Write a protein that binds this DNA or RNA. Sequence first.
DNA 1: TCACGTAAGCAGTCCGCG
DNA 2: GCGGACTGCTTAC
Length: 901
Amino acid sequence: MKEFYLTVEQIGDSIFERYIDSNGRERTREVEYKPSLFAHCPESQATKYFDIYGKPCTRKLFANMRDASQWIKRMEDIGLEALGMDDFKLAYLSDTYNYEIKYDHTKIRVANFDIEVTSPDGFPEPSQAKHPIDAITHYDSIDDRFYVFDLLNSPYGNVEEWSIEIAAKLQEQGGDEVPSEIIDKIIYMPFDNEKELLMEYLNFWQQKTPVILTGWNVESFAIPYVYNRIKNIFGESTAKRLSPHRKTRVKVIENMYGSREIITLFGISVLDYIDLYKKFSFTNQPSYSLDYISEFELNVGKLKYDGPISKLRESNHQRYISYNIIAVYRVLQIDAKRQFINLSLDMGYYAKIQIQSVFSPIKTWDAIIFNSLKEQNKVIPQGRSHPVQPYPGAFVKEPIPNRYKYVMSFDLTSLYPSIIRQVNISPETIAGTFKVAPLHDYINAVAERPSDVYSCSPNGMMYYKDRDGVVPTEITKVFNQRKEHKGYMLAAQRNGEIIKEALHNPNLSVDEPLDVDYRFDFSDEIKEKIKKLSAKSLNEMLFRAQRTEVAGMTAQINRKLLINSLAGALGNVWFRYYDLRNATAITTFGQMALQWIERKVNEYLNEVCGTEGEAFVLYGDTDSIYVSADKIIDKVGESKFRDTNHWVDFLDKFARERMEPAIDRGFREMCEYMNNKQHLMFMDREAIAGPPLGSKGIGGFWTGKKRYALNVWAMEGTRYAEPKLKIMGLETQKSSTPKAVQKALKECIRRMLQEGEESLQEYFKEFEKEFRQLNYISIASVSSANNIAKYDVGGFPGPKCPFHIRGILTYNRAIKGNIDAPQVVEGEKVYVLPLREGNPFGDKCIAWPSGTEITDLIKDDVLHWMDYTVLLEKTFIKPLEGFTSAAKLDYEKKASLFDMF
DNA sequence: TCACGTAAGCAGTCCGCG
DNA sequence: GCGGACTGCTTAC
Ligand SMILES: Nc1nc2c(ncn2[C@H]2C[C@H](O)[C@@H](COP(=O)(O)NP(=O)(O)OP(=O)(O)O)O2)c(=O)[nH]1
Ligand SMILES: Nc1nc2c(ncn2[C@H]2C[C@H](O)[C@@H](COP(=O)(O)NP(=O)(O)OP(=O)(O)O)O2)c(=O)[nH]1
Ligand SMILES: [Ca+2]
Ligand code: NA
C-alpha cells in the first residue's frame, strides 16, 4: 500500500513523524529536515521558481529549521519579502507525500476515553488534580476493546469488584443494561491502589499510543487531569510519557472573556468531540452535557442513578463503573451517526495538515493552496499584517409583513464559490479596475459595460479571463467532490419519503427489512417490495435511510462550509491571501446578481400574467428569491384544481418549463454584461408552499427580514407525504426559547398555515389555561453566560447588568456556602426563570446551569415563586402577537370589527 | 467561546426629553 | 412614557 502519515511535529531542528509504512506497520522517524525558502532575484538568476505573480525567485536551502527561521527575521529587518511555506511541518508533509493520499482508517489508532474523579468538595479542578482518579475507560479502535481501569481502594471509600454479569442484566432485573454489542468487548482491570492503576495505564498507553485521541470534554478535563494527577504523584517526567516524543506544552487558550489551559501532547492529535460537534453539527444546543446531546442525537442518554454523582461510587460502585463505560460508548454511537472523525480525516489528508487543524479553515486552505502551487514550482507570498476592517455583505430585501398564500422559491447553487469561479477572482488574476457607477445602475443594465476585455465585478475590479487562478481552481475541486455526497443525501431523503408513505396503512406480516443501498434512488423492484412490508421492517428501514441521510449530510454540508470559508478567509487579516478588494468583489457581485434576477423575474411574470408593474418577488436573502404565485394560480382558477397535489404539480411544471429558462436567459445576459469567464449562476426551484386545497390555512407569512414561515409540499426533488413546516428565524428556531414554548408556537404556526384562524384560537385558549402545569425546565429560557464577574458587585447586579446575569447572581447568593451545589460556569449556558415579587431570593429572576435540575436546596422555593404570568407574556404571547399581526389573524376572538385607533 | 465572513432580529438597560 | 443608543445574544445566508 502507499504510505501515509499519522502525526507530524517540529521539535527544534527535527521533524518527528509517526506514519504507516508500505507494509501497513506503524513507525516513527526523526528527520533532520532541511527546509527551503525563497527570495526575489534578478530576472537573470534563472531557475524554475516563480511567485504567483510571475516574478522570479531563487531558492535558499537551509541546513536546519532554526537557520531558516533566523533568515526570515533578518529579511524583515532588511525590508524584503521572505517567500515560501514558513510552517515547516507542512513543507515536510508536502515533500514526503507528493501524491494524493489514500489513507486506511482501520490502521489509524483512534482512542476514545473518559475518567471519573470522586470529589466531596465540588468540581475537581484539573489544574490542581487533588483527588484520586478512581475510574478510566479507554476504548481502542484497532482492538475494538473497552479497557476499564477500576480503583478498588481510595481515601473516599473501598468497594467491591464490578460485576460484568449484573452490568448485562436489564434495568428491570436490577442491572445496568450495558448493551449486548459491547459486553464481550470489555476488558476489566481492578487495582488495589491508585499508583498501581495509573502506572498500569501509562504502560498500556505506551503499547497502544493513540494517534487520534477523542471523547467528550477530554481536552479541557480528562487530559489535563490525567496529566496533572500523574505529575503530582510521579513527577513531571513520568507525566510526559503521555507523549510519544516526551514533550508537552501547557497551552493557554484565550478568548474575549478569559483564559483556559490545555495540555499539548506532541505526537498525538486531540479531537475533542464536543469541539467537533460544535463546529460540524450545525445545531445550537441549550446544553452541551453528554447526556443532553446523547438524548438529542440518539434518543437515549447517559445511565440514570440515585443521589449526587459525588456519592455514587460509595453507594453504587456497580452502576458507577457501568455509567463510565456507557459514557464512552455514547460518544462512539454519536460518531457512528454524525461521522465527524471520518470527516476530519478526509479534510486533513486532502489538505496535508495535522488532523487537528481541521478546526481552522484558514490553515486548511493555506495548505491546499500551497500544495497546489508547489506542483507547478510556484512560490507562495509571505504573510503580511493588516488592520481589521469591515466590508459589505449580502443583500436582503425588506419584505412587506403579510400572509402570503402560494409561494415558490428559487435559489442559486453555492453562490459565493460559484461567483469566485465565474468572475475568476484570485490574488493573481487581478487585471485592473474600472470607474464604478452606482450599484442600482448595474442592476438595471443602464451603466456603461465595464469591460470588453476583462471579467468584472460591480465593485470595480477586473480579472483576467484567460489565465487560471489558484483560488478558482482549488475551490472547484472541493465543490465537485461535494456533488457526490450531496447526491447521496438527497437520494436517502427521497427514499425516506417512500418508506413514510408505505407506513400509512402497512401490511401486518412477519418479515424483515430489505437489504438496499439508500444512497441511490429505490428501483421499481423494491418500491413494490416496500408496499408489502410490516410496520416493524418499515420503521427499521426508515432508521437506515435516515442514518444514510445524516452521513451524506455531514459529508456534503461541511465541504460547503469549507468552500464558503474560503470566501470569508479572503476577508480575514490572518489569511495569506487576504484582500478586501477580492472579498468585496464577491459580495458586491452577489448582491447585484440577486437584484438583477428579481428584476428579470418581475419582468417575465408581468408579461406572462398580463399585468403591469406587479411585485411578484416578495423577498430575497443572499442566494434566494421567493415568488408569490397567487396570480399564477388565479390564471387557472382554484376551483379547477382537483386536490393539493394537482396545484403543486402545476406550479412545479410551471417553474421548470417557464421560469427557469427565463431565469437562465436572465443570468446569461448578466454574465455577458460583466464579461465574465464562465456562466455559473444556476438558479433553480427550491420550495413550493401553500395551504391545503379547500382549507382555511393561510399557507405562509413574513414578519420581517429573516423571519418567516411556509407550509411546504416540495423541496428540490423531494415531494413530501405530509406538508412540512419551514420556519426561519422565528422563536421556534431559537435555542434561547423554552422547549415547551417552541413546541406550542410551532403548533400555533401549523394551525395558522394549514387550518386557519379558528383553529389557532382553540389552541391558544387551551394552552393559556393549561400551561402552568408544564414542567419548570420545559418553560425555562436559555442563555449563554458571559462576563458574569464584570456585572458582579458584592454578589449583586452592577450597572447595565443583563437579565440572565442577574439571574446567575441570584443563584450564587442562594447556594452560597454550600460546596456541593452545582456552580454556573463562565461561558456555558443557563436556564433562566422569572420570579414573582416578594420572593425569598431577593430579585426578579434566577438562573442555573442548563441541562440540569435545579439543586434540591432551592428547588421547592423556585417552583413556588416562578412567575407564570410574566413567563407566558414574554416567551409565548409576545412572539405570537408578532406572527398573527403580520399574518393579519387574531389569536383571540375580538368582540367588534378588528378595530384600532 | 481556539487566526472564515456580513446582515439583522429581539431582550433588556439606561438616558434624554416630554 | 417613549424613543434612541447601546450591550448581549441568536439566527440566516
Ligand atoms: N514550490 C514551492 N516550494 C516550497 C515553498 N515553500 C517551501 N517549499 C519547499 C518545498 C520543497 O521542499 C522545496 C523545493 O521544492 P521542489 O522543487 O519540489 N524540490 P527539488 O526539485 O529541488 O528536489 P531535488 O532535491 O531532487 O532537486 O521548497 C513554496 O512556496 N513553493
Ligand atoms: N463566509 C461564509 N459565508 C456564508 C456561510 N453560509 C452562507 N454564506 C453565504 C455564502 C454562500 O454562498 C451563501 C449561500 O449560502 P449556502 O451556502 O447556500 N448555505 P444554506 O444553508 O443557505 O444553503 P442550503 O440550501 O444548502 O442549506 O451565503 C458561512 O458559513 N460563511
Ligand atoms: Ca443556499
Ligand atoms: Na432569510
